[PDB]
Amino acid sequence: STTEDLAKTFLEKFNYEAEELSYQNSLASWNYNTNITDENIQKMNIAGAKWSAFYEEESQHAKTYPLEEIQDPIIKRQLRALQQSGSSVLSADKRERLNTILNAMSTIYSTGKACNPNNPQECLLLEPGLDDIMENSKDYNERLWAWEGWRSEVGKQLRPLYEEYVALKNEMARANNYEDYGDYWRGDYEEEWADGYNYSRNQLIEDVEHTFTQIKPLYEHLHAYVRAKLMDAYPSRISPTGCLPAHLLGDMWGRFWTNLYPLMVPFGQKPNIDVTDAMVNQSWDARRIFEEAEKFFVSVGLPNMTEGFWQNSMLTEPGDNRKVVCHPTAWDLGKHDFRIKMCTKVTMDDFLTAHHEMGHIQYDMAYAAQPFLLRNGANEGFHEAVGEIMSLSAATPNHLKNIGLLPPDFSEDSETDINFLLKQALTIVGTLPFTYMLEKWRWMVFKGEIPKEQWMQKWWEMKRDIVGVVEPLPHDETYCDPAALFHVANDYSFIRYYTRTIYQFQFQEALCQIAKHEGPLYKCDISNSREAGQKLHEMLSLGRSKPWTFALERVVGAKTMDVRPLLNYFEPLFTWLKEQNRNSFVGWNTDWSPYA
Amino acid sequence: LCPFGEVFNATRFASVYAWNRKRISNCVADYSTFKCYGVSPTKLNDLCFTNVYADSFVIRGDEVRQIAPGQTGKIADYNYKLPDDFTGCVIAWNSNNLDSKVGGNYNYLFRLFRKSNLKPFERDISTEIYQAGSTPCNGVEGFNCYFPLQSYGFQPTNGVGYQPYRVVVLSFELLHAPATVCGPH
Ligand SMILES: *[C@@H]1O[C@H](CO)[C@@H](O[C@@H]2O[C@H](CO)[C@@H](O)[C@H](O)[C@H]2NC(C)=O)[C@H](O)[C@H]1NC(C)=O
Ligand SMILES: *[C@@H]1O[C@H](CO[C@@H]2O[C@@H](C)[C@@H](O)[C@@H](O)[C@@H]2O)[C@@H](O)[C@H](O)[C@H]1NC(C)=O
Ligand SMILES: *[C@@H]1O[C@H](CO)[C@@H](O)[C@H](O)[C@H]1NC(C)=O
Ligand SMILES: *[C@@H]1O[C@H](CO)[C@@H](O)[C@H](O)[C@H]1NC(C)=O
């Protein structure tokens, strides 16, 4: 009797126990997020610790069926996921030391505070306090203390920790046969498959970089336009051929330029479409929104929400004694138990969010028949891409007409479209160079290409060169500014934010084709195209059972990441910016400094 | 006169692996899914049979598909098989309100492993450790050795296909013995 026999029957029994322990973890965690009590924190910890103990134990057992000896690729993909390994291969001392470090970092990020150099008793956490300054201030000096203070106080603490964290992760990664921690992380896009659905870890670098050069033009003109307006925002602070002072960019990092919008609004007298007041006047409540989001998905031929989804979801802030976490999320607890937790308000924003989050649930329902270990998006980027596609079509004036949040005789205003596409680019394309540059730095640090003595030096060389952003004050190697961002300090790969953005518009372009949409790529509304929803579902239901390259091909026709749809989405704005910049510089110096 | 209540409205059903059989003999019978294979249910109150066997267990919504002739699955292969020429009805209904509970109810089991498939209407209640590999278990679970039974785990929040369903499988028997089960005629 063959080793694939043993593997199949081992997995058959694991699936039952795993499904059960994992369901108890989901339930206890859900109990916390919808009722924060110290008792519930306890039940959440106790159950989550049971699940991870079970998993690591079973992950060792899964290793006794060598992958070489398995032929059926559905069993093979199951085992690869279970026997995927890390951190156990270290010594027990270094494994314990690593966790001490990851834990030190993660908590000094959520508790370190920085004090205003002029009001010493005003000491502000990031989480409510500095964040409010970096997202709402228009004062150069106020924004500067906050930005610099958080990077001198919280950042410098993390520097020796991050230093040692790099050493241990690389030891772990090479102990598992990867080149470095980065090569380990790029394994999340790897695929081992015949006839050209393979995808090598080094190709992710190849594809990320090649897509990025195509972005540079659109980013250059977005950059030139905001630099112009920001010059007006903060007169005599910004060079017109220079880079952007990092502390003026709209959040704590310049991760999203989206809060810069009211300083640079293209057509000030065409206020952006806001169906909030319509919703309030038609007496819509939270139930109505979600019903409407359900309607949208049926119209493309996807299922209704399960009856459990309506009993067990938490669609409003409970308003009794209970204390909750309001951040919208879409849970797949297991055992076809699907729920959304969201503190819904009657706003146009929460209307779109319900669509975005119900899209997550549709993905979850679609692959529920796959084996347990394969119930995920095709890779780390697919779930959010699918969610965002829904938010896109539901915001269009056409859909808003058909559901009567916009009068039937309403006519779209091309200037109002430019307003909307600018705000979109401030978020969507703004973040792409930020994201690519961060992971490139991280990836290089792990490879050993950047020495310790040049960490912050190459960081800002890359901020200046790639992102067109320049540090307002000089930072030596006493700083660890990349760790002053959550995902770095909390040890999370960052490239998903880049790939899922590119995936999202690949999906939407492919679906609007199928829906025989007429004009430009924004303004598209896949509503009522059962053909489009069905193509979507044919991939959604794959789970992780096929390589993501095949999964992408199932919807768009190529097995490749491709950024041309993103550029196509923004083509209207792209030509508008070009004409707006007839008398602006485009690109940046990389020599100019506020402090020079 | 027929005791269909104590098989349908029974408080505790059996585990599918140890499925229950009740012989119905010498009475009158007055008759969610309800699927018949050898006979028209609409004509049931008119017919007459020597014996009527009432088989009952619980099962997942997923698995109600398997209590039918010519089916394959853990349930049909390893717990309750119906013969290709089955002549009878499979009545099923959702029992979430009854057989699931907030902590999980785990008193319902099905056999997960067996060295061969059951013959039709065979029952197997052995609990011998299942040796999947060359090296023998010694009553000891693990190392390619498994406890043959597996628990269900019904909670009220599960999706429908994971919820408990109560099943009754009525077989109808025509021997040359005097028929003793009927309705009006
Ligand atoms: C999705 O659900 C709705 C209702 O929850 C279904 O619409 C019908 O709604 C009326 C009253 O609202 C009910 O009496 C009907 O039983 C519902 N069902 C049907 C089939 O009309 C809607 O049809 C559901 N969509 C799908 C694809 O099942
Ligand atoms: C896919 O594979 C192509 C063939 O290369 C050979 O096969 C693969 C599976 C490797 O094991 C390699 O060592 C072999 O030489 C590659 O040429 C091609 O670039 C690959 N494509 C991607 C996206 O990885
Ligand atoms: C919330 O938590 C408390 C104790 O942790 C518990 O008594 C209560 O039933 C829980 N649920 C709700 C809905 O309040
Ligand atoms: C018991 O069985 C009969 C079957 O016809 C049904 O009508 C009845 O409602 C069942 N339940 C009770 C509580 O009587």
How would you sum up this structure, described in words?
The complex is a heterodimer of chains A (596) and B (185). Chain A is mainly α. Chain A has a domain at 3-84. Chain A has helices at residues 3-33, 38-62, 73-83, 92-111, 126-136, 140-175, 181-186, 201-233, 276-281, 286-299, 307-312, 348-366, 382-395, 397-402, 414-447, 455-467, 486-489, 496-514, 530-540, 548-556, 564-580; strands spanning 113-116, 119-125, 244-245, 329-334, 337-341, 469-470. A two-stranded antiparallel ribbon of chain A has the order 1-2. In chain A, strands 3-6 form a two-stranded parallel sheet. In chain A, a hairpin with a 2-residue loop joins strand 4 and strand 5 (337-341). The longest helix of chain A is centred in the first third of the chain and has 36 residues, at 140-175. Chain A is globular. Chain B has 185 residues and is mainly β. Chain B folds into 2 domains: 1-103 and 156-185, no CATH class; 104-155, no CATH class. Chain B is built from 3 helices and 11 strands, in the order H-E-E-E-E-H-E-H-E-E-E-E-E-E. Chain B has helices at residues 5-8, 74-78, 96-99; strands at residues 20-24, 27-28, 33-36, 51-60, 88-94, 109-111, 130-131, 145-146, 149-151, 164-173, 181-182. Chain B has a 5-stranded antiparallel beta sheet with strand order 1-4-10-5-3. In chain B, strands 2-11 form a two-stranded parallel sheet. Chain B has a two-stranded antiparallel sheet with strand order 6-9. The two termini of chain B are 14 Å apart. Classes of the chains: A mainly alpha (596), B mainly beta (185). The interface between A and B is medium-sized, with 22 and 18 residues. Residues 5, 8-9 of chain B line the site of one 2-acetamido-2-deoxy-beta-D-glucopyranose.
